[PDB]
């Protein structure tokens, strides 16, 4: 299959694009504590179906603008 990620929409307001925060849960190298850690990504969506506060899966593609090398596959869990 393809490698994909899941994350939530952190903001919405851009012209056929979105930005998604990813939560990786990584152990501290010295201290041995599992710490949450984000990764904000500028993600493309044609016809901008996902709004703010959603949860969306996301795959990597060719560059579509500056940063923006990521595009959604499936919007889940939109509940407001």
């Amino acid at each position: 299959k393809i490698r994909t990620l899941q994350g939530r929409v952190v903001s919405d307001k851009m012209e056929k694009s979105i930005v998604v925060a990813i939560e990786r849960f990584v152990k501290h190298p010295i201290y041995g504590k599992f710490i949450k850690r984000t990764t904000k990504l500028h993600v493309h969506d044609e016809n901008n179906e996902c709004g703010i506060g959603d949860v969306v899966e996301i795959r990597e593609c060719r560059p579509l603008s500056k940063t923006k090398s990521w595009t959604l596959v499936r919007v889940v869990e939109k509940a407001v």
Binding site: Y31, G32, K33, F34
Partner: protein, 129 residues
């Protein structure tokens, strides 16, 4: 508030051994009965008994060999502030093998000898020395 009931259990057993207490009661759970079954199996407590219906109460009949107490030092390793997950190679032996370390592996709650023999590591709960 209570945020680590396992360390609370081990505290009950340290302070029961330290006060020459015959038996120790506490609120009960699946993990405490799993650990208590490991402790009875390895010979650190005499018996356990879970009573009650809607509020279960685990009771550990403690051991005393001579006048001295059997549970010499019980420590909580994987506390909630910082959890400790060892592999089957990193899996420690306590008092150079004379003292078990209760590891929660995917197959169940085992000792260090039993889980190093089973070929699988996990989350190391407590050192019993």
């Amino acid at each position: 508030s209570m945020q680590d009931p396992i360390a609370d259990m081990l505290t009950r057993i340290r302070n029961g051994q330290a006060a020459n207490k015959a038996a120790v009661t506490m609120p009960s759970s699946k993990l405490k009965v799993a650990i208590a079954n490991v402790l009875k199996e390895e010979g650190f407590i005499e018996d356990f008994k879970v009573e009650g219906d809607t509020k279960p109460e685990l009771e550990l009949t403690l051991k005393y060999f001579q006048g001295k107490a059997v549970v010499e030092s019980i420590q909580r390793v994987s506390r909630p502030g910082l959890r400790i997950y060892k592999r089957k190679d990193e899996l420690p032996k306590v008092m150079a093998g004379l003292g078990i370390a209760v590891v929660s592996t995917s197959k169940g709650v085992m000792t260090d000898r039993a889980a190093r023999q089973a070929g699988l590591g996990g989350e190391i709960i407590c050192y019993v020395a």
